[PDB]
Enzyme design. Structure first.
Site, PDB file in Angstrom:
ATOM      1  N   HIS A   1       0.803  -1.217   0.000  1.00 12.72           N
ATOM      2  CA  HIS A   1       0.000   0.000   0.000  1.00 12.72           C
ATOM      3  C   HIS A   1       0.840   1.272   0.000  1.00 12.72           C
ATOM      4  O   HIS A   1       0.284   2.356  -0.213  1.00 12.72           O
ATOM      5  CB  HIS A   1      -0.963  -0.018   1.191  1.00 12.72           C
ATOM      6  CG  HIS A   1      -0.285   0.069   2.522  1.00 12.72           C
ATOM      7  ND1 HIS A   1       0.045   1.265   3.120  1.00 12.72           N
ATOM      8  CD2 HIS A   1       0.108  -0.903   3.380  1.00 12.72           C
ATOM      9  CE1 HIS A   1       0.626   1.027   4.283  1.00 12.72           C
ATOM     10  NE2 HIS A   1       0.672  -0.280   4.467  1.00 12.72           N
TER      11      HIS A   1
ATOM     12  N   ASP B   1      -1.489  -7.703  -0.274  1.00 16.21           N
ATOM     13  CA  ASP B   1      -0.592  -6.551  -0.415  1.00 16.21           C
ATOM     14  C   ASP B   1       0.797  -6.807   0.158  1.00 16.21           C
ATOM     15  O   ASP B   1       1.312  -5.999   0.937  1.00 16.21           O
ATOM     16  CB  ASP B   1      -1.169  -5.230   0.155  1.00 16.21           C
ATOM     17  CG  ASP B   1      -1.852  -5.350   1.524  1.00 16.21           C
ATOM     18  OD1 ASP B   1      -2.170  -6.438   2.021  1.00 16.21           O
ATOM     19  OD2 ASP B   1      -2.075  -4.281   2.130  1.00 16.21           O
TER      20      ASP B   1
ATOM     21  N   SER C   1       4.826   1.436   9.325  1.00 16.00           N
ATOM     22  CA  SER C   1       4.385   0.115   8.907  1.00 16.00           C
ATOM     23  C   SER C   1       5.574  -0.747   8.491  1.00 16.00           C
ATOM     24  O   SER C   1       6.627  -0.251   8.081  1.00 16.00           O
ATOM     25  CB  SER C   1       3.384   0.228   7.757  1.00 16.00           C
ATOM     26  OG  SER C   1       2.205   0.896   8.176  1.00 16.00           O
TER      27      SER C   1
END
EC number: 3.4.21.90
Lengths: 161, 161
Positions: free
Chosen positions: B39, B61, B113
Protein backbone atom coordinates in the site's frame (compact mmCIF):
# COMPACT_ATOMS: atom_id res chain seq x y z
CA UNK A 1 30.23 -38.55 28.27
CA UNK A 2 28.37 -36.00 26.16
CA UNK A 3 31.20 -36.37 23.62
CA UNK A 4 33.77 -38.71 25.23
CA UNK A 5 31.40 -41.68 24.96
CA UNK A 6 30.79 -40.50 21.39
CA UNK A 7 34.53 -40.64 20.73
CA UNK A 8 34.77 -44.15 22.19
CA UNK A 9 31.82 -45.53 20.23
CA UNK A 10 32.82 -43.88 16.94
CA UNK A 11 36.17 -45.69 17.13
CA UNK A 12 36.70 -48.68 14.80
CA UNK A 13 33.57 -47.60 12.85
CA UNK A 14 34.78 -44.94 10.40
CA UNK A 15 37.25 -46.31 7.85
CA UNK A 16 39.71 -43.95 6.19
CA UNK A 17 40.74 -43.73 2.53
CA UNK A 18 44.40 -43.52 1.46
CA UNK A 19 45.12 -44.13 -2.23
CA UNK A 20 47.27 -41.23 -3.55
CA UNK A 21 48.30 -38.80 -0.82
CA UNK A 22 44.71 -37.74 -0.09
CA UNK A 23 42.26 -38.81 2.63
CA UNK A 24 38.68 -38.08 1.56
CA UNK A 25 36.34 -41.08 1.85
CA UNK A 26 34.98 -41.84 5.32
CA UNK A 27 32.72 -44.91 5.49
CA UNK A 28 30.71 -45.95 8.56
CA UNK A 29 29.35 -49.48 9.05
CA UNK A 30 25.82 -49.19 10.45
CA UNK A 31 22.78 -51.46 10.59
CA UNK A 32 24.43 -54.57 9.07
CA UNK A 33 25.31 -52.40 6.03
CA UNK A 34 27.68 -49.58 5.03
CA UNK A 35 27.59 -46.54 2.76
CA UNK A 36 29.88 -43.87 1.32
CA UNK A 37 29.28 -40.86 -0.95
CA UNK A 38 29.96 -42.32 -4.39
CA UNK A 39 30.40 -38.92 -6.07
CA UNK A 40 33.83 -38.87 -4.39
CA UNK A 41 35.85 -42.04 -4.96
CA UNK A 42 37.67 -43.87 -2.19
CA UNK A 43 39.61 -47.04 -1.42
CA UNK A 44 38.61 -49.53 1.27
CA UNK A 45 41.47 -49.88 3.76
CA UNK A 46 40.96 -53.45 4.97
CA UNK A 47 41.24 -56.12 2.22
CA UNK A 48 38.54 -58.26 3.87
CA UNK A 49 35.77 -55.83 2.88
CA UNK A 50 37.56 -54.37 -0.16
CA UNK A 51 37.32 -57.57 -2.22
CA UNK A 52 33.56 -57.76 -1.59
CA UNK A 53 31.51 -55.86 -4.16
CA UNK A 54 29.48 -52.75 -3.37
CA UNK A 55 26.16 -51.35 -4.56
CA UNK A 56 26.06 -48.26 -6.77
CA UNK A 57 23.11 -45.86 -7.06
CA UNK A 58 23.47 -42.99 -9.52
CA UNK A 59 21.03 -40.54 -7.92
CA UNK A 60 21.78 -41.46 -4.27
CA UNK A 61 25.59 -42.03 -4.67
CA UNK A 62 25.71 -44.54 -1.80
CA UNK A 63 27.14 -48.07 -1.69
CA UNK A 64 26.33 -51.14 0.39
CA UNK A 65 28.08 -54.29 1.61
CA UNK A 66 27.21 -57.59 3.28
CA UNK A 67 29.45 -57.27 6.33
CA UNK A 68 30.31 -60.62 8.00
CA UNK A 69 29.95 -61.50 11.68
CA UNK A 70 33.46 -60.97 13.08
CA UNK A 71 32.80 -57.21 12.97
CA UNK A 72 29.03 -57.49 13.48
CA UNK A 73 29.20 -55.39 16.67
CA UNK A 74 30.68 -52.29 14.99
CA UNK A 75 27.44 -50.35 14.41
CA UNK A 76 24.80 -48.28 16.21
CA UNK A 77 21.11 -48.88 16.99
CA UNK A 78 19.85 -46.41 14.32
CA UNK A 79 16.78 -44.84 15.85
CA UNK A 80 14.55 -42.57 13.75
CA UNK A 81 12.86 -39.75 15.69
CA UNK A 82 14.05 -36.12 15.58
CA UNK A 83 13.12 -33.39 18.10
CA UNK A 84 14.65 -29.91 17.83
CA UNK A 85 17.68 -30.37 20.05
CA UNK A 86 21.46 -30.39 19.88
CA UNK A 87 23.01 -33.57 18.48
CA UNK A 88 26.79 -32.89 18.36
CA UNK A 89 29.42 -34.45 16.09
CA UNK A 90 33.20 -34.62 15.69
CA UNK A 91 33.61 -30.84 15.18
CA UNK A 92 31.28 -28.84 17.41
CA UNK A 93 27.66 -29.34 18.36
CA UNK A 94 24.75 -29.74 15.93
CA UNK A 95 21.98 -27.15 15.55
CA UNK A 96 18.60 -28.43 14.35
CA UNK A 97 15.69 -26.05 13.78
CA UNK A 98 12.91 -26.00 11.21
CA UNK A 99 13.65 -29.52 10.00
CA UNK A 100 17.14 -28.52 8.88
CA UNK A 101 20.82 -28.70 9.85
CA UNK A 102 23.12 -25.73 10.38
CA UNK A 103 26.75 -25.56 11.55
CA UNK A 104 28.53 -22.17 11.78
CA UNK A 105 30.85 -21.40 8.88
CA UNK A 106 34.46 -22.51 9.21
CA UNK A 107 33.78 -25.20 11.83
CA UNK A 108 34.38 -27.90 9.21
CA UNK A 109 36.13 -28.01 5.85
CA UNK A 110 35.80 -29.53 2.36
CA UNK A 111 37.02 -33.12 2.36
CA UNK A 112 35.35 -33.92 5.70
CA UNK A 113 32.34 -35.42 3.90
CA UNK A 114 31.48 -38.93 5.04
CA UNK A 115 31.73 -38.28 8.78
CA UNK A 116 28.58 -39.76 10.35
CA UNK A 117 26.65 -37.88 13.01
CA UNK A 118 24.64 -39.24 15.91
CA UNK A 119 22.64 -38.04 18.88
CA UNK A 120 23.54 -37.49 22.54
CA UNK A 121 22.30 -41.01 23.37
CA UNK A 122 24.64 -42.50 20.75
CA UNK A 123 22.08 -43.30 18.04
CA UNK A 124 23.11 -42.66 14.43
CA UNK A 125 21.00 -40.18 12.47
CA UNK A 126 22.73 -39.11 9.25
CA UNK A 127 25.93 -38.69 7.24
CA UNK A 128 27.01 -35.31 5.85
CA UNK A 129 27.42 -34.93 2.09
CA UNK A 130 28.60 -31.31 1.96
CA UNK A 131 27.70 -27.68 2.42
CA UNK A 132 28.13 -24.16 1.10
CA UNK A 133 29.64 -21.07 2.70
CA UNK A 134 26.33 -19.42 3.65
CA UNK A 135 26.66 -16.33 5.83
CA UNK A 136 27.82 -17.21 9.33
CA UNK A 137 26.07 -20.62 9.48
CA UNK A 138 26.68 -23.11 6.67
CA UNK A 139 23.73 -25.42 5.98
CA UNK A 140 24.17 -29.18 5.60
CA UNK A 141 23.24 -32.02 3.26
CA UNK A 142 22.37 -35.28 5.01
CA UNK A 143 20.16 -38.38 4.80
CA UNK A 144 17.09 -38.85 7.01
CA UNK A 145 14.48 -41.61 6.97
CA UNK A 146 11.14 -42.39 8.60
CA UNK A 147 11.57 -46.15 9.17
CA UNK A 148 12.54 -46.23 5.46
CA UNK A 149 12.94 -44.08 2.33
CA UNK A 150 16.31 -42.40 2.69
CA UNK A 151 16.03 -38.90 1.25
CA UNK A 152 18.38 -36.10 0.25
CA UNK A 153 17.80 -32.72 1.91
CA UNK A 154 20.02 -30.16 0.18
CA UNK A 155 19.12 -26.45 0.49
CA UNK A 156 19.71 -23.94 -2.29
CA UNK A 157 23.29 -23.53 -3.46
CA UNK A 158 24.96 -26.29 -1.42
CA UNK A 159 28.36 -27.45 -2.69
CA UNK A 160 29.66 -30.97 -2.15
CA UNK A 161 32.78 -31.83 -0.17
CA UNK B 1 16.15 -9.27 30.61
CA UNK B 2 12.64 -9.03 29.14
CA UNK B 3 12.99 -7.48 25.67
CA UNK B 4 16.68 -6.62 25.17
CA UNK B 5 17.53 -10.08 23.82
CA UNK B 6 14.75 -9.71 21.24
CA UNK B 7 16.02 -6.22 20.38
CA UNK B 8 19.31 -7.96 19.62
CA UNK B 9 17.42 -10.60 17.61
CA UNK B 10 15.85 -8.33 15.00
CA UNK B 11 18.96 -6.16 14.63
CA UNK B 12 20.43 -6.19 11.09
CA UNK B 13 17.17 -7.74 9.80
CA UNK B 14 14.84 -4.80 9.15
CA UNK B 15 15.85 -2.70 6.14
CA UNK B 16 14.84 0.82 5.10
CA UNK B 17 12.65 2.43 2.45
CA UNK B 18 13.29 6.11 1.73
CA UNK B 19 13.48 8.00 -1.57
CA UNK B 20 12.95 11.69 -0.66
CA UNK B 21 12.39 12.48 3.01
CA UNK B 22 9.91 9.73 3.91
CA UNK B 23 10.60 6.44 5.70
CA UNK B 24 7.57 4.12 5.71
CA UNK B 25 8.21 0.60 4.39
CA UNK B 26 10.39 -1.76 6.43
CA UNK B 27 11.50 -5.01 4.80
CA UNK B 28 11.80 -7.97 7.18
CA UNK B 29 14.07 -10.98 6.55
CA UNK B 30 11.54 -13.65 7.51
CA UNK B 31 11.32 -17.09 5.93
CA UNK B 32 14.22 -16.79 3.47
CA UNK B 33 12.53 -13.88 1.68
CA UNK B 34 11.65 -10.19 1.93
CA UNK B 35 8.37 -8.27 1.82
CA UNK B 36 7.00 -4.80 2.47
CA UNK B 37 3.56 -3.12 2.64
CA UNK B 38 2.36 -2.85 -0.97
CA UNK B 39 0.00 0.00 0.00
CA UNK B 40 3.06 2.30 0.06
CA UNK B 41 5.84 2.66 -2.49
CA UNK B 42 8.97 0.76 -1.52
CA UNK B 43 12.50 1.69 -2.59
CA UNK B 44 15.12 -0.71 -1.25
CA UNK B 45 17.83 0.94 0.84
CA UNK B 46 20.49 -1.66 0.04
CA UNK B 47 21.38 -1.81 -3.69
CA UNK B 48 22.36 -5.48 -3.28
CA UNK B 49 18.83 -6.58 -2.36
CA UNK B 50 17.12 -4.50 -5.08
CA UNK B 51 18.49 -6.51 -8.02
CA UNK B 52 15.95 -9.35 -7.67
CA UNK B 53 12.40 -9.05 -8.96
CA UNK B 54 9.38 -9.27 -6.66
CA UNK B 55 5.84 -10.63 -6.85
CA UNK B 56 2.65 -8.61 -6.42
CA UNK B 57 -0.60 -9.56 -4.67
CA UNK B 58 -4.00 -7.88 -4.76
CA UNK B 59 -5.48 -8.13 -1.25
CA UNK B 60 -2.57 -9.70 0.67
CA UNK B 61 -0.59 -6.55 -0.42
CA UNK B 62 2.76 -8.24 0.21
CA UNK B 63 5.74 -9.15 -1.97
CA UNK B 64 8.20 -12.03 -2.12
CA UNK B 65 11.70 -12.69 -3.42
CA UNK B 66 14.02 -15.69 -3.18
CA UNK B 67 16.78 -14.53 -0.83
CA UNK B 68 20.42 -14.81 -1.97
CA UNK B 69 22.65 -17.44 -0.45
CA UNK B 70 24.39 -15.45 2.30
CA UNK B 71 21.69 -13.95 4.59
CA UNK B 72 20.17 -16.84 6.54
CA UNK B 73 22.27 -16.05 9.62
CA UNK B 74 19.67 -13.38 10.58
CA UNK B 75 16.48 -15.41 10.22
CA UNK B 76 13.84 -15.88 12.91
CA UNK B 77 11.99 -19.15 13.51
CA UNK B 78 8.49 -17.74 12.87
CA UNK B 79 6.71 -20.85 14.17
CA UNK B 80 2.92 -20.63 13.92
CA UNK B 81 1.34 -20.32 17.37
CA UNK B 82 -1.50 -18.00 18.45
CA UNK B 83 -2.20 -17.92 22.19
CA UNK B 84 -3.47 -14.88 24.11
CA UNK B 85 -0.85 -12.81 25.89
CA UNK B 86 1.84 -10.15 25.58
CA UNK B 87 4.24 -10.31 22.63
CA UNK B 88 5.82 -6.80 22.50
CA UNK B 89 6.88 -4.78 19.43
CA UNK B 90 9.16 -1.85 18.60
CA UNK B 91 7.18 0.48 20.91
CA UNK B 92 5.98 -1.33 24.02
CA UNK B 93 4.00 -4.50 24.63
CA UNK B 94 0.99 -5.71 22.64
CA UNK B 95 -2.32 -7.12 23.89
CA UNK B 96 -3.94 -9.90 21.84
CA UNK B 97 -7.29 -11.57 22.50
CA UNK B 98 -10.22 -12.76 20.42
CA UNK B 99 -8.33 -12.72 17.13
CA UNK B 100 -7.49 -9.02 17.36
CA UNK B 101 -4.12 -7.30 17.63
CA UNK B 102 -4.75 -4.23 19.78
CA UNK B 103 -2.54 -1.40 21.03
CA UNK B 104 -3.04 1.39 23.60
CA UNK B 105 -4.09 4.68 22.01
CA UNK B 106 -1.30 7.02 20.96
CA UNK B 107 1.41 4.40 20.38
CA UNK B 108 1.18 4.72 16.58
CA UNK B 109 1.98 7.22 13.85
CA UNK B 110 2.08 7.28 10.03
CA UNK B 111 5.21 5.91 8.43
CA UNK B 112 5.96 3.02 10.82
CA UNK B 113 4.38 0.12 8.91
CA UNK B 114 6.45 -3.00 8.33
CA UNK B 115 7.43 -3.62 11.95
CA UNK B 116 7.70 -7.39 12.52
CA UNK B 117 5.40 -8.17 15.42
CA UNK B 118 7.03 -11.07 17.24
CA UNK B 119 6.13 -13.33 20.13
CA UNK B 120 7.49 -13.10 23.67
CA UNK B 121 9.62 -16.19 22.98
CA UNK B 122 11.56 -14.73 20.04
CA UNK B 123 9.66 -15.77 16.88
CA UNK B 124 8.22 -13.23 14.46
CA UNK B 125 4.45 -13.44 14.07
CA UNK B 126 3.27 -10.87 11.53
CA UNK B 127 3.88 -7.51 9.82
CA UNK B 128 2.19 -4.23 10.65
CA UNK B 129 0.09 -2.72 7.84
CA UNK B 130 -2.49 -0.32 9.25
CA UNK B 131 -5.08 0.38 11.91
CA UNK B 132 -7.25 2.96 13.67
CA UNK B 133 -8.44 3.82 17.17
CA UNK B 134 -11.71 2.42 18.53
CA UNK B 135 -12.64 4.02 21.85
CA UNK B 136 -9.68 3.63 24.22
CA UNK B 137 -7.81 1.14 22.00
CA UNK B 138 -6.36 1.01 18.48
CA UNK B 139 -6.85 -1.96 16.18
CA UNK B 140 -4.22 -3.47 13.88
CA UNK B 141 -4.11 -5.28 10.53
CA UNK B 142 -1.51 -8.01 10.02
CA UNK B 143 -0.87 -11.28 8.18
CA UNK B 144 -0.92 -14.61 10.02
CA UNK B 145 -0.55 -18.21 8.89
CA UNK B 146 -1.63 -21.57 10.32
CA UNK B 147 1.56 -23.26 9.05
CA UNK B 148 0.28 -22.31 5.56
CA UNK B 149 -2.34 -20.12 3.84
CA UNK B 150 -1.45 -16.62 5.05
CA UNK B 151 -4.64 -14.67 5.74
CA UNK B 152 -5.77 -11.11 6.44
CA UNK B 153 -7.91 -9.28 9.00
CA UNK B 154 -9.34 -5.79 8.66
CA UNK B 155 -11.49 -3.69 11.01
CA UNK B 156 -13.80 -0.97 9.77
CA UNK B 157 -12.26 2.50 9.65
CA UNK B 158 -8.73 1.14 9.35
CA UNK B 159 -6.06 3.54 8.13
CA UNK B 160 -2.75 2.30 6.80
CA UNK B 161 0.16 4.17 8.33
Amino acid sequence: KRERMCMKIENDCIFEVKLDGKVTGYACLVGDKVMKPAHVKGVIDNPDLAKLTYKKSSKYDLECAQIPVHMKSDASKYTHEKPEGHYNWHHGAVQYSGGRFTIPTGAGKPGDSGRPIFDNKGRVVAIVLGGANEGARTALSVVTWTKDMVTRYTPEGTEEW
